[PDB]
Symmetry: C3
Subunit: 120 residues, 3 copies
Amino acid sequence: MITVFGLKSKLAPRREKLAEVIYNSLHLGLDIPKGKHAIRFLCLEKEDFYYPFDRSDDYTVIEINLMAGRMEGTKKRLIKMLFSELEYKLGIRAHDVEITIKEQPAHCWGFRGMTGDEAR
Amino acid sequence: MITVFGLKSKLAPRREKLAEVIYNSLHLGLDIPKGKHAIRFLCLEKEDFYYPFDRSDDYTVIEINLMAGRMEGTKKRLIKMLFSELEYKLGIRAHDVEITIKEQPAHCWGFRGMTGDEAR
Amino acid sequence: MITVFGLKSKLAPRREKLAEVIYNSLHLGLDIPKGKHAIRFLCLEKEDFYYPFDRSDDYTVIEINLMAGRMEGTKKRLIKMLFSELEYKLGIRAHDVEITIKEQPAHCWGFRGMTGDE
Ligand SMILES: N[C@@H](CCC(=O)O)C(=O)O
Ligand SMILES: [Cl-]
C-alpha cells in the first residue's frame, strides 16, 4: 500500500486527482495497471504536522511500498515522474514534495492467499 | 509495532477480534506472547481509502515490523497463518488481505532503554 | 518523515516538547539542523491502540526514516539519546518507548525534485 500524508486543508480536496496521478505514474513508470494498488490518504490537522521550516503548507509526503526486484533507474524514474505529475498537474512544487520507496523481499509480502515469492 | 488499516465501518467492529488473531498468530507462529507487541488500528473514512478496484470494502492491510534475523520460511508461515486465521475467524476473504513484513537490523530498534542488538 | 504515535490523551499536550526533543537528538546525534526533517504526530483513541499489556498508557512509538549511509554506532546513539530525552525531559519512561530506524537507499528517496542519490 501507498500512503499520501498532508495538511488536511490542502490535501483534502486533492484526493481524487492524486490517486489518478499516482495510478498513472505507477502504470506508465512500472507497468503496474491502474487500481492494482491500494492508495491511502492521511489528512493531518495543523498541530500534528511539523513539516520542514523552509517549506509551505502544500508539503506532501508519499510512501510507496514495493516488492524488491526493480532496477534503481526504474525506481528513480517513478520518483521523477511523480514530481512532474504533481507540479504540472496539481501545482505542487517539487519543493514541497517528499517521497520514499520502501522495498521488502517478495517473501515478506502476502496477497491473494499467497506470499509474493510464490505469485506467478 | 504492527498496524492494521481498514475501512472504519468494517474494521471498528472487528478491532478486538483482529488483535486476538494477530496476537494468536504471532504467538502461534513466531513464539511472541499474547501482548508483547504493540498493535495499532487505523480506521479509514471512505474518502481516504482507495483499495484495489476489484476488492471489497473488507480490504485490510497489515504492516508488521520485526527485528531482522528470522529465516524466510518463518516469515512466510506467519503470512500464511494470518491468511487462514482471518478467513476462519473474521470471514475476511484472503483475497481481501494484504500483508507486508518489514524488517530492520537489531541495532535500529529501541525498547526498554536498549538498542535491539544489546538486548539480552 | 519521522512519526510519533501515542494515546491522544497523553500525546497531544506533549507534541511541541516532543518535536523539540527529536530535533535536538537529530542535531546532536546526526548533525541534522533543526527543522530539516518533517515530524508527524498520530494521536490515538483508546480503542485503536493495543499497546503491550504490561506497558502503560504513556506508550510511545517513534518511527524514523533515514537515507541509508550512516554508521551503526550513530544510529544506536540517536536511539539512546532519544530514551534519555523523553524520560528526563518529558517523564516518559524508557520502558514505555519503542523506536525504530528505517533506512532506504538514497536512490529510493525523492525531495525538492531530485532523487537522494542526486
Ligand atoms: N498491491 C500489491 C499486489 C496485490 C495483488 O497482487 O493482488 C503489491 O504491492 O504488489
Ligand atoms: Cl498512519
